[PDB]
């Protein structure tokens, strides 16, 4: 399968770049309980980070300028971000790493689904220990070159760390590697780390000789959150972004912008996400399909619990069906929620994974309208 052809299943990314008279504060309390950032992620099954972040969109110039032959993806889970990168840059090879709980044979599930094969992942971390897959461990960085002898020009980190200290542990280790490593030193100090960070306190200095070049605030990030992507390099250290700066960019995006839908619809993926939400749910999701699902339940303890869960889902999809076609924005998402009477029953009955799937299906339905 052609990687550039697969790129049409990924939505266009909206973001703000902050390069490193009182400003004023932009506030908007959206009365929402659902993770609406998954609204345009219906074409992806195991992970969907590529719908939020892109290397061509955010750091396209650096990608052009450095021209890496190998990219290093750490804390990458199912590898949807790596999969989008493989579609944007079809000649790039990858070194993949993500924290593993066992010695069992693992592989980025989303990359395999999107790209087809793993031939471009020259190091998938096969046969690696738990610590050798942990970005906060020295051994992880010492075995990063076991296959690839290319310098860490651009390292991508999307790890969801336990505590904020873990982020620093990783950054310090990246710095310690790029300044000791025979391969990386031979290159120079023009080495980059594009890492996920949760901006909380202000005036938090980055480790010694780690400088922030830019901060990226993504539309696809949880609205209540403080998540951003920082582009780091070697040089005189500066401050990390603070919660304040991030919220203002997070708010302008939420208030001003709409979510772009993917140009093409991956029907196999949508059908997979539907069956993941409510087993047996088929596309197109219409009046007929919702009455069919309602008819399956009346044909008849955990038995009453799973049917209660099903009624909750059908009821929500029925509300989406009987709702006007609007633009994909938080003003419309707030209208959708605040016009549904059983919102609190919905969040109580459904689990986090089910609710994320419910929003992906809702998004498919909203895009399908008219
Ligand atoms: C948000 S997911 C990455 C999603 C990825 N960008 C994608 O497209 O699928 C975060 C991943 O980081 C991993 N992780 C958590 N702590 C880690 C650590 N200390 N070192 C490395 N990976 C870690 C988690 O196990 C999880 O798979
Ligand atoms: Zn190195």
Residue numbers in the entry: 1616 to 1635, 1642 to 1921, 1936 to 2005
Please share text taken word for word from the publication where this structure appeared.
These viruses encode a large RNA polymerase (L) (usually >2,000 amino acids) that is crucial to viral replication. As a part of this study, we expressed CR-VI+, a 406-residue fragment comprising CR-VI and the adjoining ‘+ domain’, the variable region carrying the K-K-G-motif, investigated its MTase activity and solved its crystal structure. Besides sequentially methylating the 2′O and N7 atoms of small capped RNAs, CR-VI+ also 2′O methylates uncapped substrates and displays nucleotide triphosphatase (NTPase) activity. Both the CR-VI domain, which assumes a fairly standard MTase fold, and the K-K-G motif of the (mainly helical) +domain are required for the MTase reactions.
Most notably, hMPV and flaviviruses share an unusually long (∼10 residues), flexible β2λ (that is, the loop immediately following the β2-strand), which forms the SAM-binding pocket (SAMP) along with loops β1λ and β4λ, shielding it from the solvent. In CR-VI+, β2λ similarly assumes alternate conformations. In the ‘closed’ form, the ligand’s ribose group is hydrogen bonded to D1725, and—via a water—to D1722. Loops β1λ and β4λ also show a degree of flexibility.
